[PDB]
Each structure stands twice: as C-alpha cells, then as structure tokens.
Amino acid sequence: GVNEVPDYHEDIHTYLREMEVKCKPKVGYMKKQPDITNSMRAILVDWLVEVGEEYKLQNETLHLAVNYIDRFLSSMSVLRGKLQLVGTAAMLLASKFEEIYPPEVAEFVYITDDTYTKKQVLRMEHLVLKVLAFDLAAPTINQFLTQYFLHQQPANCKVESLAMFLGELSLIDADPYLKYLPSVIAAAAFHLALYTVTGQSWPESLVQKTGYTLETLKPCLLDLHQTYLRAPQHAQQSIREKYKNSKYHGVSLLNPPETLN
C-alpha cells in the first residue's frame, strides 16, 4: 500500500544511504574539543530524552537533535557552560522541522532552568542554522528501522520497541557509536532485538536490501550487545525508564541474551 511507497522505497533507501554519509559527524571530534567530553555529552543527550518525554515529542525529533549537535560540535569549539545552549537550540530546530505542533520557544527557555535568556536561544538557533547550512533533513537510525521493520512477517511490536530502545542507547555514548553510520546501528539494533525476542537473525531480504551481512555488522553488534548488558549500570538512565512504560511494551525490563553466535 501507498503508505509504504512501493514505487519509491528503493530510491528513497539508496538516497538516505548517500545522505547519511554527508550528514556524518566527525568521529572523535571530542578529542579536539578542549573543554567538553563524551561524559558531558552523554548528560546532554540523556536530558534531551527527558525533554522529549515531557513535551511528548517524536523519537525522530530527538534523533535529529543529536545529529545537529554532533555536526555543530564537529565545526565549533564550545565551552561546557554553552554546551546546553547548543543542545536546546538543536532540539528547537528538530522540533520545528519534524513536529506537527513544536513547543514554543518560551518552553525551551524554561527547560534550561533560566540558565539562558530567550535571546541566547534564538541567536544560537541562527548560529546552528548557519553552521549546518540549513542541511537539516538528516537520515536517522529511526528512518532505517521503520524501513527494516517492513521485512518482518508478521510484525512483532516487541521486536520494534526493543530495536527502538537499543537505537536510542547509542545516542548517549559518542564512544563508540560515532564510528557507525545510522543505517549500521539500525541494522545491529534490529538483528539484536529480533534475536532477543524471537530467536531469529537478520533476514536474507534485508541483506539483499542493505548489502550488510552479519559479518559486516559484527563490530557494531559487539559494541551494542555490551551497551545493552551494561545499561542497568550506565550513569544515564532516562531511556531505560522511558522504555519500561507500557507504551513501549516494557522492553527495557527484558533480559538481554548472554551471547550471540
């Protein structure tokens, strides 16, 4: 049916793959930021997750916001005191891009606890737009996941939730996830959600779609498997809490498999 744009799925996929390379942040920009760290950034993203839940934003919006932040920080040095201003400005842009009903600018100045003024938020908005050159339609993990889901037969909502959950966990830790493209993280999160819930692996049909095999997805799956196992102990917990709720089928409460062939 036309909701799955059959006449266009292949072209769209091919384009998002080329586009995810151009929207790709510099791996290890963090070492080149004198005053900010992966830990600080983890705190930032985790906070954006909360903001996301409090304003009932789309998951896609949160994923766009992190793309914007990582590209911005690939180009500009930012002091720790201004890190949150970047993050707030990027969620405002993400919201304006993606949401039917974005929160008003005032609401974004309130979530910072008046750390910043409205003028800072709007000026940073402009600066972020200039630095990204208005290239905001970035392919996300979610855009690849919803596509990979169509290869299910039948659809399993717990598979879908779980792959969403693992996908977001990756947002938090620039090490190692900045080295993996969204379409890779997506693929690893889906195989691993599928393995956990059904016992099944990455399908042949998606091998044919993506070109990725379990061999080529191994590095990313090793990292992602470890993140999942350690999630209970991670300093940042907002995504686990988010995905305990009924809405996402309680998947964060599931026991990860101890191993995978």
Binding site: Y15, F97, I100, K119, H126
Partner: protein
C-alpha cells in the same frame, strides 16, 4: 549583503511576505527575492522557512525551482531564487480566449510528473500543488515551486499535519480525515491540475469541506467498498451521503483523447493505494508523442 541586487518590482507576496523581482548588478542575472522577517525576540526562524530551505537544498532537478542562495542578516533572511516569467494560474487566465494547445498541456503535465517523481524519490511530499505554485518560463519549461508546506517523510509514513493542501486540490483521504496520507495526495492535485489545464476551470471548486466531497462524488461517483475498500470506515465518512453515478470523462474533459481520459482517471482513483504514481504515469501512452513546445506569451 544585498548591495549587488537592484529591486525591479514586487512580483507578488506569500507566506513570508513580499517576493521581489531583482537584478544582479554585476552578473545581469534576474532573480526572485523572498524576504523573510526573523522574529529575533519572539519565535526565531519560521518552521515554514526551515522546511523550504532545507528541502530545496536537496532537490536539484530541472522541473523544481532552483534556490540559488540564502543571504543572512541578524534581522532578515533573503531567499534568492531563479526568476520565472509567471505561474500556471496566470497563464491559464491569460489563455481564456485563445485556449491552450494540447501538445503544451501534455508537455507541462509530463514535466510536472518528472519534478514530482523526483520529490517522492527523495522522501519529500509537496502538499500544496496548485496552479499558483507552478512556474513557467518563456521556453516551454514548468517547475514545482513554493515548498513552504512541504515535508520530508519516512517509510512507512506517519501522521502529519491534517490542515494541508488548498481545498480545491485536496485528496479525499484528507477530507475524510484519515490517519495517514502519502505520495498519492500529490498525484491527486496534479490530476485536478491536468483537468484544469484542459478546461481552464477548476475541476472541484468547493465552498467547504462537505461541499468539496459532494463535488468529487458528483463527478467520479460516490465511493463504496468495491471501489475503495475501507472508505465506509473512514472517520468523516457518512452513510447518508447521496449515491451519485460516475460521469463519463467525455463530459468532464471533452477535449481530451482516450489516452488522456485513461491517465486522468488513474490520477483520480479514490483508493490512494490504487492511484497511479508519478513514476508510473511517466510511462503512460499519453506521453509517447510528448514534445516541448514554447508557450505564446
């Protein structure tokens, strides 16, 4: 910033405000300048502009209007576009007593479908196709314009803004208030535009939402489950709807040959799933003899 541009005349207004025709004093290029006020103390850069700029920066095609530059100040955004002579609505109006030649109609439709197929292939819904948003030049070209209400979609689509597309060009899925719509809504609008190029009158000029549906049903026949499965389960569907028969396209678009009738009808299928795609339409027998004539201007 704008020192190299000389304004020539207001060429109209729009969402952001005034659109001016201007000339590059150094290169001689004629352009359209869209000035967008930035709400520097209140709301910042409009979502409408963020969407138009970002999506147009991706879409490079001969049948989509070209965004040439984006000039920043602290207080304003100026969008520099290619300049095109006029829009399709003005052209149709101007052709009221001469009619429009069929080869030119076919050419324009073919080009619109090429532009649209390019959007769809690139995950963009236009969501505002109407004559006033289609720009022609003096050389026989036509281009999709005003991406103000466009939207990058994912696969499968999710719920987007319902208040979309001018009423006359609005697909029945949106009118019946369905959870999800897709690329098909754009094909509907083009179908309405094909009709309108042939007759130079709008196909479904509704006064209201209920009126718009009735006008569609009067012409295409009141849909039922056989024609459109799940229609009667749609939120805004009413079992009291009068049951009108379909009208022969020989009365709807008399000038149109059997090929045009066939393509027009596939473009106006009720069921969004059965409605033809831009890709598919490009292969229709209507286009086998397509050429690119110049308009009379």
């Amino acid at each position: 910033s704008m020192e190299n541009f000389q304004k020539v005349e207001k060429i109209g207004e729009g969402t952001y405000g005034v659109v001016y025709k201007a000339r590059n004093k150094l290169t001689g290029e004629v352009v359209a300048l869209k000035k967008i006020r930035l709400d520097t103390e209140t709301e910042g850069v409009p979502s409408t502009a963020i969407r138009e700029i970002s999506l147009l920066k991706e879409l490079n095609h001969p049948n989509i209007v070209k965004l040439l530059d984006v000039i920043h100040t602290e207080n304003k955004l100026y969008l520099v576009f290619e300049f095109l002579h006029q829009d399709l609505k003005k052209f149709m109006d101007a052709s009221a007593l001469t009619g429009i030649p069929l080869p030119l109609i076919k050419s324009y439709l073919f080009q619109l479908l090429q532009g649209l197929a390019f959007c769809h292939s690139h995950r963009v819904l236009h969501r505002d196709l109407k004559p006033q948003n289609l720009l022609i030049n003096t050389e026989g070209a036509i281009k999709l314009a005003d991406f103000g209400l466009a939207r990058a979609f994912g696969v499968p689509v999710r719920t987007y803004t319902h208040e979309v597309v001018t009423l006359w060009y609005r697909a029945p899925e949106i009118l019946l208030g369905c959870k999800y719509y897709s690329t098909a809504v754009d094909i509907w609008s083009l179908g309405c535009i094909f009709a309108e190029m042939v007759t130079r009158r709008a196909l479904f000029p509704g006064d209201s939402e209920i009126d718009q549906l009735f006008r569609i049903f009067r012409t295409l026949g009141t849909p039922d489950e056989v024609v459109w499965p799940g229609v009667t389960s749609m939120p805004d569907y009413k079992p009291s709807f009068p049951k009108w028969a379909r009208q022969d396209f020989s009365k709807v678009v008399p000038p149109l040959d059997e090929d045009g009738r066939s393509l027009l009808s596939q473009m106006l299928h009720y069921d969004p799933n059965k409605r033809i795609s831009a890709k598919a339409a490009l292969a229709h027998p209507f286009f086998q003899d397509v050429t690119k004539p110049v308009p009379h201007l």
